Design an enzyme around this catalytic site. Sequence first.
Site, PDB file in Angstrom:
ATOM      1  CB  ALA A  56      -0.939   0.007   1.205  1.00 46.81           C
ATOM      2  CE  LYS A  62       5.250   6.785  -2.468  1.00 41.55           C
ATOM      3  NZ  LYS A  62       5.941   5.661  -1.776  1.00 41.55           N
ATOM      4  CG  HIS A 227      -0.951  -0.305 -15.913  1.00 43.41           C
ATOM      5  ND1 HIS A 227      -0.082  -1.370 -16.010  1.00 43.41           N
ATOM      6  CD2 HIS A 227      -0.308   0.638 -15.185  1.00 43.41           C
ATOM      7  CE1 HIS A 227       1.054  -1.064 -15.408  1.00 43.41           C
ATOM      8  NE2 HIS A 227       0.942   0.148 -14.897  1.00 43.41           N
ATOM      9  CE1 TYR A 228       2.334   3.289 -20.352  1.00 41.09           C
ATOM     10  CE2 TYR A 228       3.531   1.242 -20.023  1.00 41.09           C
ATOM     11  CZ  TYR A 228       3.453   2.614 -19.909  1.00 41.09           C
ATOM     12  OH  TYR A 228       4.495   3.315 -19.350  1.00 41.09           O
ATOM     13  CG  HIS A 289       0.511  -1.970 -24.583  1.00 42.09           C
ATOM     14  ND1 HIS A 289       0.862  -0.729 -25.069  1.00 42.09           N
ATOM     15  CD2 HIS A 289      -0.841  -1.984 -24.528  1.00 42.09           C
ATOM     16  CE1 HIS A 289      -0.231  -0.021 -25.293  1.00 42.09           C
ATOM     17  NE2 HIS A 289      -1.278  -0.760 -24.973  1.00 42.09           N
ATOM     18  CG  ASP A 446     -13.130  11.693 -36.760  1.00 36.34           C
ATOM     19  OD1 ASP A 446     -12.812  10.557 -36.357  1.00 36.34           O
ATOM     20  OD2 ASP A 446     -13.339  12.656 -35.992  1.00 36.34           O
TER      21      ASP A 446
END
Lengths: 525, 530
Positions: A56, A62, A227-228, A289, A446
């Site tokens: 933690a 953190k 997490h990427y 990734h 787009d």
Amino acid sequence: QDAYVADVDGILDVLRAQVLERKPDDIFQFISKSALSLQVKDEQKSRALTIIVFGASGDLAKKKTFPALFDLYCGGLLPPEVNIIGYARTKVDDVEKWKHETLMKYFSNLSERGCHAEDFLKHISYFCGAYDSVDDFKRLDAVIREKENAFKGPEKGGNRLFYLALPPSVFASVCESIHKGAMPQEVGGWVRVIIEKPFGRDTKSSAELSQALEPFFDESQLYRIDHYLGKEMVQNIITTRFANRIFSAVWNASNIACVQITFKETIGTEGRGGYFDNIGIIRDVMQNHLTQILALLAMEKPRSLDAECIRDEKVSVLKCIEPITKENCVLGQYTASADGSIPGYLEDVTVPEGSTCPTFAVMRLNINNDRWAGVPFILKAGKAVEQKYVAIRIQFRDEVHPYGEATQRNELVIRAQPSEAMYVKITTKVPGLSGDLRQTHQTELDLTYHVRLPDAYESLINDALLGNSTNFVRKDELDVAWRIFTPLLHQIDSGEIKPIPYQAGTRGPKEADEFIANNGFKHQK
Amino acid sequence: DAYVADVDGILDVLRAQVLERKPDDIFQFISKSALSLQKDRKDEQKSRALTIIVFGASGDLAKKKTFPALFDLYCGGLLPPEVNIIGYARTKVDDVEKWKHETLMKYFSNLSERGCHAEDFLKHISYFCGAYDSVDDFKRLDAVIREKENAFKGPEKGGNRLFYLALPPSVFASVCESIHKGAMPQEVGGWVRVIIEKPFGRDTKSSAELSQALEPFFDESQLYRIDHYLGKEMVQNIITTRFANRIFSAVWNASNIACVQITFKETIGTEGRGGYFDNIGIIRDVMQNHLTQILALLAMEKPRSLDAECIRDEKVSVLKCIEPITKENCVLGQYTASADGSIPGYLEDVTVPEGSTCPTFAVMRLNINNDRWAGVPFILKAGKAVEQKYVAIRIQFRDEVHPYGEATQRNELVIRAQPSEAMYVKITTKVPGLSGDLRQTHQTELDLTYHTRYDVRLPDAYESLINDALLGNSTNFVRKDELDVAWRIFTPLLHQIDSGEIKPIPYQAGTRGPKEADEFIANNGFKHQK
């Protein structure tokens, strides 16, 4: 009774966080005008929820995991009575001081969220113990089981998410402590454990680590983080292609000429270079990734949109990828730049002498099936380079006829960083005075149909909270993914290929740009 | 004052942009076009002298249709500086220069954003009174033309001659013989081109006869059959988007396309000119000529160049594969008075006979039968006095039923060319609002063409073919064999309509038309977004 002192020190330091996030002309009035400013979702609440974060007060938890949880509290994606428990070995005097100076300094955007900030800390409690002591897990089991029954819900028991914000060497023993002392009650509830990279460093390393956790949690409960990768860019790959006949019919070797997945970062390894020196750019982001990204591009049609049929096709298509060979790879290692604002990679004291570790690499992968045979897939990642730009780029075959040099290859690009974007590059008529059929001009079209926005990490954590296992590598695919890269990794450690120098801020080694051009990529001109 | 006379200058550009283009989701349009303006930051026709002879110079078409068109081209710099235009008609003209200002100049567009450019142009105009059949009168014209060809300070010999036949087709054969015998260009140099106007026959044999009457005088390199409703802008959308791009080229066949609908709509009735239409019919008015040419451009195979006659080669190419329209595949309508009462019925016209079976509305199915198109239904629709005013293409690709099921519907490419031009592809995308599911989708619209220049009121559709004919571009003009194959498609149906085997169904003005027609579209592969 304890700390009226800690209550204000929390109030003052949120206000100090805002003065340094919105630099005030009149600090005196900012501190005061923002003084008194701090004044089915059916199924969240069916049962209580507990988030246990190990390590933690480690740097990962953190700085990245607890601040992440803060954003979901403000976004309203957490249940109203969630409790979060920080787990670390070192003792803390008063916990509320620890929340204000270890957790809350790293909460971002506190001028829009500051009023929620001190409320959020009321949901976190501290617990000091060891990651291997079965008794402390029985004391942890006791502490969470006493707020699970204090739950105001209709339906009893509780759901438990354990976040192992730890080094991987600790993983197997924390998962044993859960099994013997911290599994959810049989009265009701699931258990899910999120584990963090590095998941091994080659085929044999990672099979061993996954075999250590096999008896304790199955693939329905283990959530390997990447997490990427974000939810935004995965529904771009899946929905645009598979719900639309325009793209579904053109998504193969008969119409595609070149695919390049590119990961660039402007920053090198600032002061953690010694930690990187054992990893290499391939292991850091490419094997994990860029490969999961590549898995989604090349997969055959999943016969549902259920999580495990999407993951089912990720193993099928990675199983067709021949392992990278040393001839099909180019490596770089960044040095000091002519600007002088960045020291060289070896100008770091943390990194040993003469190491051949790459900060940049580009490789070619050959997918071997009917759909993709012949199409070169190009992965490129590099640290300390020109710009910060992660993007996918697909080049379709040129229509040489009848337009010849009045047209070039159609191009589909998906960009996730710095800003999300999806667009296709095509040739269209120019509104010339007389006009002309041979006078065309390339355009960009787009495809995105544009309040707090969750980043990649938050909607991966939230995906685990909602039971969505899609964007987490699973046991079988992690193995077959490793089997793709390690023959190259072994040959690189054997020195059979060596990194080519490039100074930071450049595009990288120019042999890398040559490799891209000689493998089916054609540049605008 | 302080730079927002500039800022209102470019929501000015967006205001014109959004109401030229039906968004129906206006909100992201104005944004997706606010950011696309972020990135938005011919010697030889003096080679020779040029003379344009417009016949019927005081006929209703020439004064109202063609002379204003040439003026707009004069301001655009698309006519040579020494151009000579001469009006040819018999009607008495005592004073000629008064006649130009106040039979010709009252119909000149814009008239005072231009400035005195109007009177500059009329100074290139001369009058000539003569008959449309007198070989002697054409030798007098040839003399007056050689007296305007000789005033040219170019190095180049000769003169180029464009004859515009603003006449009914019954006069065509005699002016083309008169030009041949007495008014062909000088032997020292120059070409001759004839523009002939709308009704080219009324069936296979009528129109075959008219073309063999003109065959002995001019070849297809010299005859320019005009269709003022096509325009260069929309054929460059049909041709370039599909053939320069593999994304569209690969899906432009039966394996990915489900249904294509070509539609011609007008809110206006017959304007009281009804008896006049009564012998034409909406099919002959726009369907056999204009919409069929449009359909030809969509369905043509790859031309092996972009030269006009290789494009036309592929246009007759594909029209030869169309089985003739059959009456079972056809429904007709006739417009009546409106519920507002603001439009009178077609038969409420004094010009139209009692008991006429003339259609003001038709929608049909055409079967193109070759490898590329077998199975794909092609639907042509034309209608007067209806909901709205729009000609547009609608192509619906086959649905990807898996894996998205009912979170997706058929992809759609549309080309709409008007004053209200638009081109866009409509497909399903992720919604970024995170309740983080894949089944959680929304269809949206993607434009390809934006209006960015706006420096201009640049050539309209009709002005672009006149300029194309001056430049030698035969692309938007039907050819002898191609005009034949078009008639052979429609004439078995037209005869059955005249024989009364099918008649038009009544509908009130302002509605979509007959209600049996919309069901016909639904029963032939067409699907509604829902």
